[PDB]
Design an enzyme around this catalytic site. Structure first.
Site, PDB file in Angstrom:
ATOM      1  N   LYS A   1       3.731  -2.143   8.686  1.00  0.00           N
ATOM      2  CA  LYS A   1       5.007  -1.607   8.240  1.00  0.00           C
ATOM      3  C   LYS A   1       6.140  -2.502   8.738  1.00  0.00           C
ATOM      4  O   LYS A   1       6.182  -2.877   9.911  1.00  0.00           O
ATOM      5  CB  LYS A   1       5.171  -0.169   8.735  1.00  0.00           C
ATOM      6  CG  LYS A   1       6.539   0.454   8.496  1.00  0.00           C
ATOM      7  CD  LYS A   1       6.767   1.564   9.510  1.00  0.00           C
ATOM      8  CE  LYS A   1       8.131   2.214   9.374  1.00  0.00           C
ATOM      9  NZ  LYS A   1       8.213   3.381  10.294  1.00  0.00           N
TER      10      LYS A   1
ATOM     11  N   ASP B   1       3.390   9.968  12.179  1.00  0.00           N
ATOM     12  CA  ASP B   1       4.829  10.188  11.946  1.00  0.00           C
ATOM     13  C   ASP B   1       5.488  11.066  13.015  1.00  0.00           C
ATOM     14  O   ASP B   1       6.476  11.761  12.756  1.00  0.00           O
ATOM     15  CB  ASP B   1       5.083  10.743  10.538  1.00  0.00           C
ATOM     16  CG  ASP B   1       6.334  10.165   9.889  1.00  0.00           C
ATOM     17  OD1 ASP B   1       6.940   9.226  10.455  1.00  0.00           O
ATOM     18  OD2 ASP B   1       6.706  10.642   8.793  1.00  0.00           O
TER      19      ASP B   1
ATOM     20  N   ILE C   1       0.807  -1.226   0.000  1.00  0.00           N
ATOM     21  CA  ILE C   1       0.000   0.000   0.000  1.00  0.00           C
ATOM     22  C   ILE C   1       0.846   1.286   0.000  1.00  0.00           C
ATOM     23  O   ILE C   1       0.348   2.364  -0.327  1.00  0.00           O
ATOM     24  CB  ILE C   1      -1.073   0.000   1.135  1.00  0.00           C
ATOM     25  CG1 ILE C   1      -2.170   1.047   0.864  1.00  0.00           C
ATOM     26  CG2 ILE C   1      -0.432   0.185   2.514  1.00  0.00           C
ATOM     27  CD1 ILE C   1      -3.032   0.792  -0.386  1.00  0.00           C
ATOM     28  N   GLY C   2       2.124   1.158   0.341  1.00  0.00           N
ATOM     29  CA  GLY C   2       3.021   2.303   0.404  1.00  0.00           C
ATOM     30  C   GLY C   2       3.422   2.899  -0.938  1.00  0.00           C
ATOM     31  O   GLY C   2       3.222   2.293  -1.992  1.00  0.00           O
ATOM     32  N   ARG C   3       3.971   4.109  -0.882  1.00  0.00           N
ATOM     33  CA  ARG C   3       4.651   4.724  -2.012  1.00  0.00           C
ATOM     34  C   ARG C   3       6.145   4.795  -1.702  1.00  0.00           C
ATOM     35  O   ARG C   3       6.978   4.894  -2.608  1.00  0.00           O
ATOM     36  CB  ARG C   3       4.096   6.113  -2.276  1.00  0.00           C
ATOM     37  N   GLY C   4       6.468   4.731  -0.410  1.00  0.00           N
ATOM     38  CA  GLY C   4       7.845   4.781   0.069  1.00  0.00           C
ATOM     39  C   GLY C   4       8.009   5.681   1.281  1.00  0.00           C
ATOM     40  O   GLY C   4       8.792   5.375   2.186  1.00  0.00           O
TER      41      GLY C   4
ATOM     42  N   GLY D   1       7.906   4.118   4.561  1.00  0.00           N
ATOM     43  CA  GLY D   1       8.642   2.852   4.514  1.00  0.00           C
ATOM     44  C   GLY D   1       7.998   1.881   3.537  1.00  0.00           C
ATOM     45  O   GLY D   1       7.432   2.292   2.516  1.00  0.00           O
TER      46      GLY D   1
ATOM     47  N   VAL E   1       4.964  -0.675   3.395  1.00  0.00           N
ATOM     48  CA  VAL E   1       3.740  -0.947   4.134  1.00  0.00           C
ATOM     49  C   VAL E   1       2.905  -1.960   3.360  1.00  0.00           C
ATOM     50  O   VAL E   1       2.795  -1.889   2.136  1.00  0.00           O
ATOM     51  CB  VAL E   1       2.930   0.363   4.424  1.00  0.00           C
ATOM     52  CG1 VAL E   1       1.776   0.103   5.387  1.00  0.00           C
ATOM     53  CG2 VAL E   1       3.845   1.453   4.996  1.00  0.00           C
TER      54      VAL E   1
ATOM     55  N   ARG F   1       1.640  15.574   4.636  1.00  0.00           N
ATOM     56  CA  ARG F   1       2.085  14.231   4.215  1.00  0.00           C
ATOM     57  C   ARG F   1       2.079  13.223   5.368  1.00  0.00           C
ATOM     58  O   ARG F   1       2.046  12.018   5.139  1.00  0.00           O
ATOM     59  CB  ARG F   1       3.499  14.296   3.607  1.00  0.00           C
ATOM     60  CG  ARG F   1       4.586  14.590   4.635  1.00  0.00           C
ATOM     61  CD  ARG F   1       5.977  14.753   4.044  1.00  0.00           C
ATOM     62  NE  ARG F   1       6.891  15.284   5.063  1.00  0.00           N
ATOM     63  CZ  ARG F   1       7.246  16.566   5.186  1.00  0.00           C
ATOM     64  NH1 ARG F   1       6.790  17.490   4.343  1.00  0.00           N
ATOM     65  NH2 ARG F   1       8.068  16.925   6.159  1.00  0.00           N
ATOM     66  N   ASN F   2       2.135  13.736   6.597  1.00  0.00           N
ATOM     67  CA  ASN F   2       2.241  12.926   7.803  1.00  0.00           C
ATOM     68  C   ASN F   2       0.932  12.843   8.562  1.00  0.00           C
ATOM     69  O   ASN F   2       0.910  12.465   9.731  1.00  0.00           O
ATOM     70  CB  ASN F   2       3.329  13.488   8.723  1.00  0.00           C
ATOM     71  CG  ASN F   2       4.709  13.346   8.139  1.00  0.00           C
ATOM     72  OD1 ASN F   2       4.956  12.472   7.315  1.00  0.00           O
ATOM     73  ND2 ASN F   2       5.621  14.204   8.564  1.00  0.00           N
TER      74      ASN F   2
ATOM     75  N   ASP G   1       7.582  16.619  13.496  1.00  0.00           N
ATOM     76  CA  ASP G   1       7.496  16.490  12.042  1.00  0.00           C
ATOM     77  C   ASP G   1       6.055  16.643  11.520  1.00  0.00           C
ATOM     78  O   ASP G   1       5.576  15.837  10.720  1.00  0.00           O
ATOM     79  CB  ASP G   1       8.110  15.162  11.581  1.00  0.00           C
ATOM     80  CG  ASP G   1       8.506  15.172  10.108  1.00  0.00           C
ATOM     81  OD1 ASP G   1       8.352  16.224   9.441  1.00  0.00           O
ATOM     82  OD2 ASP G   1       8.981  14.125   9.615  1.00  0.00           O
TER      83      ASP G   1
HETATM   84  C1  LIG Z   1      -4.223   3.794   1.737  1.00  0.00           C
HETATM   85  O1  LIG Z   1      -2.841   4.170   1.830  1.00  0.00           O
HETATM   86  C2  LIG Z   1      -2.229   4.100   3.060  1.00  0.00           C
HETATM   87  C3  LIG Z   1      -2.850   3.566   4.196  1.00  0.00           C
HETATM   88  C4  LIG Z   1      -2.166   3.518   5.412  1.00  0.00           C
HETATM   89  N1  LIG Z   1      -2.774   3.017   6.502  1.00  0.00           N
HETATM   90  C5  LIG Z   1      -2.157   2.958   7.676  1.00  0.00           C
HETATM   91  C6  LIG Z   1      -0.844   3.413   7.820  1.00  0.00           C
HETATM   92  C7  LIG Z   1      -0.170   3.954   6.721  1.00  0.00           C
HETATM   93  O2  LIG Z   1       1.121   4.428   6.792  1.00  0.00           O
HETATM   94  C8  LIG Z   1       1.697   4.642   8.013  1.00  0.00           C
HETATM   95  C9  LIG Z   1       1.263   5.620   8.908  1.00  0.00           C
HETATM   96  C10 LIG Z   1       1.940   5.746  10.127  1.00  0.00           C
HETATM   97  C11 LIG Z   1       3.051   4.955  10.463  1.00  0.00           C
HETATM   98  C12 LIG Z   1       3.691   5.067  11.713  1.00  0.00           C
HETATM   99  C13 LIG Z   1       4.340   3.942  12.232  1.00  0.00           C
HETATM  100  N2  LIG Z   1       4.938   3.948  13.418  1.00  0.00           N
HETATM  101  C14 LIG Z   1       4.936   5.030  14.220  1.00  0.00           C
HETATM  102  N3  LIG Z   1       5.545   5.030  15.422  1.00  0.00           N
HETATM  103  C15 LIG Z   1       5.947   3.950  16.106  1.00  0.00           C
HETATM  104  C16 LIG Z   1       7.250   3.905  16.615  1.00  0.00           C
HETATM  105  C17 LIG Z   1       7.684   2.790  17.333  1.00  0.00           C
HETATM  106  C18 LIG Z   1       6.806   1.725  17.550  1.00  0.00           C
HETATM  107  F1  LIG Z   1       7.207   0.643  18.244  1.00  0.00           F
HETATM  108  C19 LIG Z   1       5.506   1.767  17.055  1.00  0.00           C
HETATM  109  C20 LIG Z   1       5.081   2.875  16.334  1.00  0.00           C
HETATM  110  N4  LIG Z   1       4.280   6.201  13.782  1.00  0.00           N
HETATM  111  C21 LIG Z   1       4.259   7.424  14.632  1.00  0.00           C
HETATM  112  C22 LIG Z   1       3.648   6.213  12.518  1.00  0.00           C
HETATM  113  O3  LIG Z   1       3.082   7.240  12.149  1.00  0.00           O
HETATM  114  C23 LIG Z   1       3.458   3.982   9.557  1.00  0.00           C
HETATM  115  C24 LIG Z   1       2.783   3.847   8.351  1.00  0.00           C
HETATM  116  F2  LIG Z   1       3.176   2.924   7.469  1.00  0.00           F
HETATM  117  C25 LIG Z   1      -0.852   4.001   5.498  1.00  0.00           C
HETATM  118  C26 LIG Z   1      -0.234   4.524   4.362  1.00  0.00           C
HETATM  119  C27 LIG Z   1      -0.922   4.572   3.147  1.00  0.00           C
HETATM  120  O4  LIG Z   1      -0.347   5.084   2.018  1.00  0.00           O
HETATM  121  C28 LIG Z   1       1.013   5.492   2.181  1.00  0.00           C
END
Ligand SMILES: COc1cc2nccc(Oc3ccc(-c4cnc(Nc5ccc(F)cc5)n(C)c4=O)cc3F)c2cc1OC
Ligand SMILES: COc1cc2nccc(Oc3ccc(-c4cnc(Nc5ccc(F)cc5)n(C)c4=O)cc3F)c2cc1OC
Lengths: 276, 272
Positions: free
Chosen positions: A57, A169, A31-34, A37, A39, A155-156, A151
């Protein structure tokens, strides 16, 4: 390793840990673009017997105990947050042969910047103010917990199926002046970034200061120069943004103040395409 | 900034916290010149009520939580060549206090740079062997130092080197470009440390700019052999600076090797 770590810390993070026999990761369904990370689509079986679709992730193979330990205390902090405008952590998965997994609720509409950038979507002025108001509510919550995001950007921020904005993020063109020179990040530093995030929303995802270089940003801001009022931005909301970009941190509005201010501007507007 | 943190993390740190009623700090009695921050003479009462002379460093929920887990990590290490943590003091009004055993001879760089001191080539190699042993311990715990240098190692009363403070001119080539630190990245920094010791605390790369250091090492230019450094020890240094991270020796091999070089010398003014 797996647990060459401190027993007390491992005990502290248990409540955040997800047993891998309750997690399926579809590594062929990206589902990610990068940006966040790599995902993947996941299925999580909770202790309550409920099976839910989620986002997973995969971390880089973390190779030292210092890093793993910091990771785990970050997990502990995020698990503790509970607000509709702050992204939830469902848990973390520590596997025997492979990097840790971060398990999150699926966010149907991805991040806020990309949602507002594609022409297929038509947010009104009120929709965009609404997204910023949700961002401010989540940031008000985080500030109340003494937590600096560090941050904040469009985007976040994530958007779920109910069009609920989730702050995630927790970058020089989003940074406060004091952060650029003195390297200090506070809740008032997040207020500056929020201002930039509002600007992003009211331009529908335009890149800030597109003609100034990343190293030239500090001298630009010392000329009294600010980002210009976006095309969708109402005059009273622009004055909110300007207040967020006061060079002295103490002179910026609180997130609690931003919530009541933007909320008042929001209630004057009508016409929505994306409700809740 | 009080303990309104996660209760389980707070319970995880309990074994590291010192009750402030067992600690006196002499805030008017200052230690050092600011590299380690605000450090002061302290007196600490142990679990038996024994008075122990200590150094006391005065320091959002994210930063405080990470600080606590670094304290949990440090409190766990148990090795004569690694600085131990006596504990942390989280006050009702004021910054956290970090409590460390008092190190009579301060940091190693300052000790060797002092003309009053007369360490022999053997003494300097010995101090390098001590650093290597502490680092072999840390590596065995899967822990990366990240800031290994002569200024970051301490000397106690019994001339025991204690690796502490776990800097581009000490950084490995892959750290200067990829920002990634490993145990082999520590090996590089140790080589710079060995070089520091042999030159008795001379600044490395004194003629080249901080930003011109990455291109300098890419050309294949290194730190020249110290005047009074033994040939086999400079070979060790060059092996520590191998452009391929995986080609550098382990700290286990550094110990045994430096142990051998050390053993071929006589003459110690600072015996351990
Ligand atoms: C439809 O399209 C999408 C859907 C999505 N849905 C759900 C999450 C997405 O992306 C993320 C968002 C958030 C984080 C994220 C991970 N860890 C932490 N912190 C953390 C530190 C340590 C620890 F142990 C646990 C946690 N934080 C603060 C985050 O924000 C990771 C992600 F992959 C999605 C992305 C998408 O398109 C790109
Ligand atoms: C007489 O001359 C000196 C004597 C000294 N004696 C004893 C300590 C000195 O300096 C220090 C050495 C080490 C550290 C140190 C603190 N915290 C952590 N980590 C840490 C993180 C979080 C947490 F909760 C606890 C711990 N580490 C990894 C350290 O190395 C602090 C110091 F002030 C002395 C300095 C001197 O001259 C300046």
């Amino acid at each position: 390793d797996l647990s060459a770590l401190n027993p007390e810390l491992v005990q502290a993070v248990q409540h955040v840990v997800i047993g891998p026999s309750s997690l399926i990761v579809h590594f062929n369904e990206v589902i990610g673009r990068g940006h966040f990370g790599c995902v993947y689509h996941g299925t999580l079986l909770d202790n309550d017997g409920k099976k839910i679709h989620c986002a997973v992730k995969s971390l880089n193979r973390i190779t030292d105990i210092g890093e793993v330990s910091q990771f785990l205390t970050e997990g502990i902090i995020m698990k503790d947050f509970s607000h509709p405008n702050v992204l939830s952590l469902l848990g973390i998965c520590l596997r025997s042969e492979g990097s840790p997994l971060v398990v999150l609720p699926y966010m149907k509409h991805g991040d806020l910047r990309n949602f507002i950038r594609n022409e297929t979507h038509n947010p009104t002025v009120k929709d965009l103010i609404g997204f910023g108001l949700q961002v401010a509510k989540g940031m008000k919550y985080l500030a109340s917990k003494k937590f600096v995001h560090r941050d904040l950007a469009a985007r976040n921020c994530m958007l779920d199926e109910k069009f609920t904005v989730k702050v995630a993020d927790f970058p020089v063109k989003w940074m406060a002046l004091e952060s650029l020179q003195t390297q200090k990040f506070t809740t008032k530093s997040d207020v500056w970034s929020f201002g930039v995030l509002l600007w992003e929303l009211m331009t529908r995802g335009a890149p800030p200061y597109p003609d100034v270089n990343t190293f030239d940003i500090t001298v630009y801001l010392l000329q009294g120069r600010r980002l210009l009022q976006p095309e969708y931005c109402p005059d009273p909301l622009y004055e909110v943004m300007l207040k967020c970009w006061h060079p002295k941190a103490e002179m910026r509005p609180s997130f609690s103040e931003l919530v009541s201010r933007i909320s008042a501007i929001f209630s004057t507007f009508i016409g929505e395409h994306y409700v809740h």
